[PDB]
Amino acid sequence: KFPRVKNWELGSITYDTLCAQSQQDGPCTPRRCLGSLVLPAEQLLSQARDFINQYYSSIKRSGSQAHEERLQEVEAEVASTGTYHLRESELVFGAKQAWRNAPRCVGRIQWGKLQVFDARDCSSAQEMFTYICNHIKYATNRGNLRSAITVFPQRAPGRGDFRIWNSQLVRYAGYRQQDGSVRGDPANVEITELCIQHGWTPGNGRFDVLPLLLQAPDEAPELFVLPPELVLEVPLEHPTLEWFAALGLRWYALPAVSNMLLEIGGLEFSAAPFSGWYMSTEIGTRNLCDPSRYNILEDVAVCMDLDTRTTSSLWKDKAAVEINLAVLHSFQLAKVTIVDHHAATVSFMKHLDNEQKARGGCPADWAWIVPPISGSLTPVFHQEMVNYILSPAFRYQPDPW
Amino acid sequence: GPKFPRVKNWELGSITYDTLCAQSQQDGPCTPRRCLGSLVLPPAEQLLSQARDFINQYYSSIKRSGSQAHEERLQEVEAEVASTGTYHLRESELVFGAKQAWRNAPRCVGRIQWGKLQVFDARDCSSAQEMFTYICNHIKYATNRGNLRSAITVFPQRAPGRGDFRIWNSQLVRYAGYRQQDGSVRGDPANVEITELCIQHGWTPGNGRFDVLPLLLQAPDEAPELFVLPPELVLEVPLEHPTLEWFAALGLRWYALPAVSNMLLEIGGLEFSAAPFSGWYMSTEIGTRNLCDPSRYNILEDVAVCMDLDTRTTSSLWKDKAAVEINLAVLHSFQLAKVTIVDHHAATVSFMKHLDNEQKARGGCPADWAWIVPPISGSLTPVFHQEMVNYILSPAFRYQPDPW
Ligand code: HEM
Ligand code: HEM
Numbered sequence: 027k028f029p030r031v032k033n034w035e036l037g038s039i040t041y042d043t044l045c046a047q048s049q050q051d052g053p054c055t056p057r058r059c060l061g062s063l064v065l066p067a068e069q070l071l072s073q074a075r076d077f078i079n080q081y082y083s084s085i086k087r088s089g090s091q092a093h094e095e096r097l098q099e100v101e102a103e104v105a106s107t108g109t110y111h112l113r114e115s116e117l118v119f120g121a122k123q124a125w126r127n128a129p130r131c132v133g134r135i136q137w138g139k140l141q142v143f144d145a146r147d148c149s150s151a152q153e154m155f156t157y158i159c160n161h162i163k164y165a166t167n168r169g170n171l172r173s174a175i176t177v178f179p180q181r182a183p184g185r186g187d188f189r190i191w192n193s194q195l196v197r198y199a200g201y202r203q204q205d206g207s208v209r210g211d212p213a214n215v216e217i218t219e220l221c222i223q224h225g226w227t228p229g230n231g232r233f234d235v236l237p238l239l240l241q242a243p244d245e246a247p248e249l250f251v252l253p254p255e256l257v258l259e260v261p262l263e264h265p266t267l268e269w270f271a272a273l274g275l276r277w278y279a280l281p282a283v284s285n286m287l288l289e290i291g292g293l294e295f296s297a298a299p300f301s302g303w304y305m306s307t308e309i310g311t312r313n314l315c316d317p318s319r320y321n322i323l324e325d326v327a328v329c330m331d332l333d334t335r336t337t338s339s340l341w342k343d344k345a346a347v348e349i350n351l352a353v354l355h356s357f358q359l360a361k362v363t364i365v366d367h368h369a370a371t372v373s374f375m376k377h378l379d380n381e382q383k384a385r386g387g388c389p390a391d392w393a394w395i396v397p398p399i400s401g402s403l404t405p406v407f408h409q410e411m412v413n414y415i416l417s418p419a420f421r422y423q424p425d426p427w
Numbered sequence: 428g429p430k431f432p433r434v435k436n437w438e439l440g441s442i443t444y445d446t447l448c449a450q451s452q453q454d455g456p457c458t459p460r461r462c463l464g465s466l467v468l469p470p471a472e473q474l475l476s477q478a479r480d481f482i483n484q485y486y487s488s489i490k491r492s493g494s495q496a497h498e499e500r501l502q503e504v505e506a507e508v509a510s511t512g513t514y515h516l517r518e519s520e521l522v523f524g525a526k527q528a529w530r531n532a533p534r535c536v537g538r539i540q541w542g543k544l545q546v547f548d549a550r551d552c553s554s555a556q557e558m559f560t561y562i563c564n565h566i567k568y569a570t571n572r573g574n575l576r577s578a579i580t581v582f583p584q585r586a587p588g589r590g591d592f593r594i595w596n597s598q599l600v601r602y603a604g605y606r607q608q609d610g611s612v613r614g615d616p617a618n619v620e621i622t623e624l625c626i627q628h629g630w631t632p633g634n635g636r637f638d639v640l641p642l643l644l645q646a647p648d649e650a651p652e653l654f655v656l657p658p659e660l661v662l663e664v665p666l667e668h669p670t671l672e673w674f675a676a677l678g679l680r681w682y683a684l685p686a687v688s689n690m691l692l693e694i695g696g697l698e699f700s701a702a703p704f705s706g707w708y709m710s711t712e713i714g715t716r717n718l719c720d721p722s723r724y725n726i727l728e729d730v731a732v733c734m735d736l737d738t739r740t741t742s743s744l745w746k747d748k749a750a751v752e753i754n755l756a757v758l759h760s761f762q763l764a765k766v767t768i769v770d771h772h773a774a775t776v777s778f779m780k781h782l783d784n785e786q787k788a789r790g791g792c793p794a795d796w797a798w799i800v801p802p803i804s805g806s807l808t809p810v811f812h813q814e815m816v817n818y819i820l821s822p823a824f825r826y827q828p829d830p831w
């Protein structure tokens with residue numbers, strides 16, 4: 027009923043009553059455990075009501091008439107339209123809760139701090155881009171990054187979704203040239219050709235910042251060049267290895283995830299983008315030396331000076347380390363918020379902790395909390411965790427086309 | 428699609444379907460309403476079925492499924508369990524029974540070498556003492572002057588209305604950890620509760636750090652006896668680093684052979700209570716679990732101090748600068764001493780190749796992702812970008828209640 031959750035570093039034995047809330051199921055079954063897998067009217071009121079109780083409880087005003095005369099209002103609204111709309115305050119609480127509820131997210135200690143720009147008063151892709159510059163301008167805060175989420179209108183069935191066509195407001199470009207080899211970012215290959223398709227002058231630099239494809243409910247998407255000025259790019263240097271930056275490397279400073287769906291009390295917003303700040307490894311481990319991506323490992327080391335004739339030689343580790351460090355130093359230098367996998371993990375164990383007090387636990391995808399490198403070297407690694415689907419929650423959806 | 432688990436490799440974009448999981452006659456903790464994947468600690472008529480489950484595998488493995496040979500092996504255990512209550516396995520039935528447990532077991536990265544396994548049959552051992560002899564014999568084959576082979580040494584099974592053979596020492600090689608007055612420990616924080624028993628069962632401790640414990644060898648309804656390994660058998664690797672000379676001086680040593688020995692091996696509804704198996708290490712085990720864990724040898728601080736590292740803040744990556752070196756230096760030692768060992772990269776490759784191989788024979792492979800992926804440099808390795816399907820198959824090495 028309530029899974030015993032020993033931590034193995036301290037001997038800390040905790041118990042989860044939060045799961046019993048999760049009213050919506052996942053990939054695992056009694057006989058097999060798909061833990062590691064990457065992807066998956068009558069009922070609307072059901073989720074409305076509950077969420078609205080979720081809400082009022084927060085501000086402790088649960089029960090009181092305001093409560094029930096909103097439960098009055100939403101009950102009727104759907105009973106006469108098919109759908110309902112959330113007040114500002116309501117979606118603020120909800121968008122927050124989605125973050126709080128996302129089990130792949132190590133950066134959760136921070137969920138309280140979140141700006142919730144309300145873009146539901148938008149109807150043109152030409153307003154969209156604007157609503158997004160006001161987002162990027164507020165989050166970048168020219169160094170001191172701040173966590174925020176601009177939310178475009180809800181989906182309603184008689185028509186298309188508003189969508190952002192690229193999977194992170196900022197991404198570098200990808201250019202497969204006869205060779206079957208890519209200049210720039212190989213993830214962002216499929217996307218870049220679409221911008222070429224829907225009219226775009228392409229670049230060729232290792233890191234060319236892209237445009238923006240925004241589509242409004244039924245309508246050919248529209249291209250919008252991000253004012254270069256508004257894109258905080260971080261040069262990349264090594265604190266002790268002078269040879270480095272000659273490599274000509276960098277990364278953007280703002281991680282805005284645009285391709286996800288937001289679910290609140292049943293209502294779903296297809297486009298609702300959001301952006302905190304980077305966790306070192308993300309850039310220097312995955313986004314770089316990872317083959318399926320920038321894949322730098324080899325050079326880094328050939329430079330460094332390490333026997334790639336053999337793996338046991340351990341060049342791949344010694345290389346990451348320095349790239350993963352060469353990132354923090356640059357970032358800390360160029361004075362741009364950034365949190366390292368160690369700094370990160372401690373604080374989550376405090377989240378993990380603080381949450382246990384409030385709610386009776388916190389769902390967490392273990393296989394994802396644990397950093398991409400040096401696992402055993404973080405506290406999270408030695409901590410059993412439970413992951414289950416809650417709500418309001420962030421979900422994936424089909425690539426717009 | 429195919430009404431079966433669907434397993435993608437997010438590096439080659441390949442897919443594969445698990446058909447084998449519908450073999451698992453054992454459920455785990457996970458329900459579709461939450462996932463306890465992370466979690467560490469997890470008759471007669473209802474024994475007889477467990478048995479038939481086995482034989483059928485044995486036969487449909489020599490490929491004689493259907494024969495009289497088969498249909499009368501089943502018409503004999505039915506006879507044995509009927510009149511006995513238990514049932515003894517035939518010779519090569521067991522040898523099979525072991526390799527399957529290994530093959531079946533979800534947390535073991537080292538399964539490409541799965542059919543190498545030597546089965547030493549010791550189902551005749553009836554003296555607490557004789558046990559020692561076997562074990563000793565094992566180590567010498569297993570050690571092989573350093574060319575470590577794999578192997579296992581089944582001692583007899585349980586009877587309803589008998590005692591149990593048991594090997595107390597969780598592992599056959601355990602470094603003594605003496606509770607200090609400091610409130611601290613000199614030795615190996617893990618092997619304390621056991622060091623503490625050796626003393627109560629009559630062991631005079633030395634007081635080093637890498638003292639080798641003695642074995643506490645139980646035999647049914649007999650208080651365990653105490654045996655010391657002749658040091659010539661217990662091969663030991665001093666630790667140095669290829670560049671950092673000072674490393675050597677840390678005094679750090681470590682032992683070649685892992686032998687797990689407090690695990691119940693279950694074949695066909697049988698229980699082998701003392702059933703100890705060995706192989707060779709994977710560097711990170713020693714250099715990350717053993718020598719770096721905050722609650723073991725935890726050398727990470729001392730080592731970072733020497734490489735002259737800003738251990739004041741985490742954004743110097745001192746920890747990551749250290750482990751890496753410490754993990755390397757551990758490999759560079761078995762290079763040198765000509766002792767067997769496999770590094771995470773090398774190892775995590777064979778796994779895919781095992782996975783690839785196994786997709787053909789069984790059409791599936793049980794894998795406990797968290798345990799398959801190495802405690803340094805996850806993404807750095809192939810296994811990392813691979814979805815996996817954990818589940819309970821038999822033969823099976825089970826966890827077992829410690830005797831006292
Ligand atoms: C403040 C800085 C933050 C850090 C350091 C952080 C950390 C992370 C990391 C490392 C991941 C895994 C990303 C990956 O490897 O794919 C993640 C996942 C996630 N994060 Fe954050 N996070 C932060 C803020 C946020 C914010 C502001 C939101 C938006 C409300 C958010 C929502 C999510 C969601 C929904 C996932 C699930 C990943 C998925 O299933 O695709 N995070 N978080
Ligand atoms: C050939 C050399 C081998 C290597 C390199 C290897 C590697 C590993 C490693 C690294 C682990 C996880 C260790 C941990 O983090 O605690 C493991 C688990 C395991 N291994 Fe092996 N292994 C080898 C041989 C064997 C053999 C010979 C057996 C016995 C037949 C075996 C049975 C198991 C079992 C049952 C587990 C998981 C048990 C559990 O904790 O639930 N392995 N293996």
Ligand SMILES: Cc1cc(N)nc(CCc2cccc(CCc3cc(C)nc(N)c3)n2)c1
Binds near residue numbers: 282
């Ligand atoms: C806020 C935030 C903070 C932070 N430190 N890092 C990120 C970027 C990493 C990330 C976080 C959350 C979700 C995704 C999208 C992953 C994804 C999933 C699918 C199904 N398809 C894709 N193309 C991409 N990426 C975002």
Ligand SMILES: Cc1cc(N)nc(CCc2cccc(CCc3cc(C)nc(N)c3)n2)c1
Binds near residue numbers: 537707712826
């Ligand atoms: C052959 C072998 C090869 C190799 N590379 N590593 C090991 C050691 C890792 C291991 C493999 C299998 C089982 C266990 C035991 C886990 C355990 C359980 C309990 C109950 N207490 C413990 N202290 C440890 N440990 C053994």
Ligand SMILES: C[C@H](O)[C@H](O)[C@H]1CNc2nc(N)[nH]c(=O)c2N1
Binds near residue numbers: 062395398811812813
């Ligand atoms: C196949 C595997 O499940 C997948 O690559 C996961 C594993 N763990 C991860 N952990 C983090 N932090 N980020 C990730 O993208 C992933 N990817």
Ligand SMILES: C[C@H](O)[C@H](O)[C@H]1CNc2nc(N)[nH]c(=O)c2N1
Binds near residue numbers: 411801
């Ligand atoms: C709590 C945590 O899940 C557990 O202790 C696991 C994590 N991953 C591991 N992975 C390996 N290889 N070995 C381990 O002991 C562990 N410990």
Ligand SMILES: [Zn+2]
Binds near residue numbers: 054058457463464
């Ligand atoms: Zn699971």
